[PDB]
Amino acid sequence: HHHHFNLPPGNYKKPVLLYCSNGGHFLRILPDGTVDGTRDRSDQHIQLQLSAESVGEVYIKSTETGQYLAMDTDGLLYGSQTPNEECLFLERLEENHYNTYISKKHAEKNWFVGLKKNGSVKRGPRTHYGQKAILFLPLPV
């Protein structure tokens, strides 16, 4: 147990857009497996479906391509065709409002899903508690 257990109130009944408070980008998983952010609300690759695998642990899946968000051994996010250990994230409430996603595999290292102000994803080791890059709001599609 390396992290707190404050959980967000939302559920996984329907797909969502994961809006990053840092630069206002939506998390996107492109067909080729690339992960980044875009401000284009009409983009077809920002619709994501979350599912609970265990209380507080989720998969984040592209509804358009079926790919799973995953963080590799060097902290880089990628789209995986199949669910694996790198695809589980600890979904937590942060600052009493936002959702944060910590890599379960690398939870002890405090590696988060984060977006920079320019729309590029942050590498795990460059993220940490306290940043704006790690704060997301799940918006209904």
Deposited resolution, Å: 1.6
Which pairs with CB-CB distance under 8 Å and at least 24 residues apart come from 25-33?
25/115, 25/119, 27/60, 27/69, 27/113, 27/115, 27/136, 29/62, 29/65, 29/67, 29/69, 29/79, 30/79, 31/65, 32/79, 33/67, 33/78, 33/79, 33/80
Rounded to whole angstroms, the Cα distance separating 33 from 35 reads: 6
> Is 22 marked as a binding-site residue?
yes
Experimental method: X-ray
Residue of 83, 66, 82, 79 lying closest to 113 (CA atoms): 79
Tally of residues, the chain: 141
Q: Residue 120's Cα: distance from chain center in Å?
A: 13
Q: Which domains does the chain have, with CATH numbers?
A: 1-141 (2.80.10.50)
Counting Cα atoms < 13 Å in the Cβ hemisphere of 12 gives: 16
**For residue 115, what is the DSSP state?**
B
Specify the amino acid at residue 118.
Answer: N
Neighbours of 140 (CB within 10 A): 9
In whole angstroms, give the CA distance from residue 61 to residue 52. 11
| Distance between CA atoms of residues 2 and 74, nearest Å | 20
